[PDB]
């Protein structure tokens with residue numbers, strides 16, 4: 001996490017309190033991750049599995065998180081399989097533990113999604129179609145969602161802190177910053193309506209869902225916010241192109257294969273006008289820019305490996321040159 005949060009975190013005290021709030025024994029806790037949030041797995045008395053995610057008010061308010069929890073509950077009540085929030089013993093979706101410094105650690109729990117992450121055996125057109133139908137149902141459902149408290153309102157796409165590349169990258173990279181500013185201006189020219197824009201997951205990839213008996217169960221809604229539906233799609237495409245489970249021989253051909261199957265599924269559940277498909281390259285480029293910033297947080301600029309330096313140089317050059325993320329001509333899908 002943030003170093004201040006790490007400095008304030010008394011892990012034993014927090015897990016002791018969490019054990020009381022969520023009715024589990026300390027001995028049944030497994031540490032999973034600490035890079036972004038603190039994430040743990042546990043089992044309760046009856047043997048069911050749960051995921052405990054801990055953040056802090058320095059990163060996000062309780063009410064912002066409650067907006068995610070409210071939306072996930074709405075999706076679940078409309079027949080979408082998601083890792084559902086679990087109320088604490090006090091009937092709360094988010095539990096705050098004061099840190100004695102004016103802030104609070106924010107605890108929340110979800111059901112552990114059944115199954116596990118996709119494997120080589122799963123990486124095929126059937127998966128891609130299932131992802132399309134899952135995403136399509138999410139988009140069709142979200143159209144009717146209304147925020148119940150103004151404090152719970154999730155961000156608009158352009159409010160994303162990680163798009164503020166000037167915060168993350170060297171200030172002499174004026175061309176990269178020009179490219180980002182210009183692309184943002186172009187995306188702001190797109191029309192917004194209920195049928196094309198809404199609250200979406202915004203971090204879809206195969207690290208953020210399980211596959212169980214041929215069905216998708218998503219989790220990690222922590223970046224959910226208001227986007228064009230085609231950006232939710234584009235983010236998933238970016239991610240399958242970046243870390244494919246099986247290497248592809250030809251990036252353009254794979255893009256076409258993924259998209260053909262995905263869209264076949266998507267059409268089962270939602271109606272998206274073909275004109276949006278042409279915007280995918282622009283949204284892929286925006287994601288590429290966001291990742292470039294992230295790599296600067298990820299890497300120590302003062303002790304870079306040769307591979308890290310090469311990756312940063314590649315992203316920079318691609319952004320400056322406007323090299324498309326994929327060579328695929330999206331007009332082929334029409």
Ligand SMILES: Nc1ncnc2c1ncn2[C@@H]1O[C@H](COP(=O)(O)OP(=O)(O)NP(=O)(O)O)[C@@H](O)[C@H]1O
Pocket residue numbers: 032033035036037038039051053083110111112113207208219220222
């Ligand atoms: N509801 C869930 N069901 C099953 N496994 C989960 C669930 N939530 C999280 N996990 C697992 O725990 C890991 C970390 O959780 P995640 O919510 O992705 O953490 P994060 O702190 O947001 N880090 P990041 O992966 O950078 O988004 C995931 O990659 C899964 O392996």
Ligand SMILES: CC(C)C[C@H](NC(=O)[C@@H](O)[C@@H](O)[C@@H](N)CC(N)=O)[C@@H]1Cc2cccc(O)c2C(=O)O1
Pocket residue numbers: 160162202203205206207208223239240242243290291294298
């Ligand atoms: C450390 C980070 C660069 C890792 C990256 N994650 C992302 O690119 C996104 O989660 C972020 O870009 C996103 N959280 C940014 C945001 N603020 O919405 C990667 C993306 C990814 C793609 C395909 C499969 C995966 O398992 C993953 C994965 O787990 O994470």
Ligand SMILES: [Ca+2]
Pocket residue numbers: 207208220
């Ligand atoms: Ca994740």
Ligand SMILES: [Ca+2]
Pocket residue numbers: 036220222223
């Ligand atoms: Ca996350």
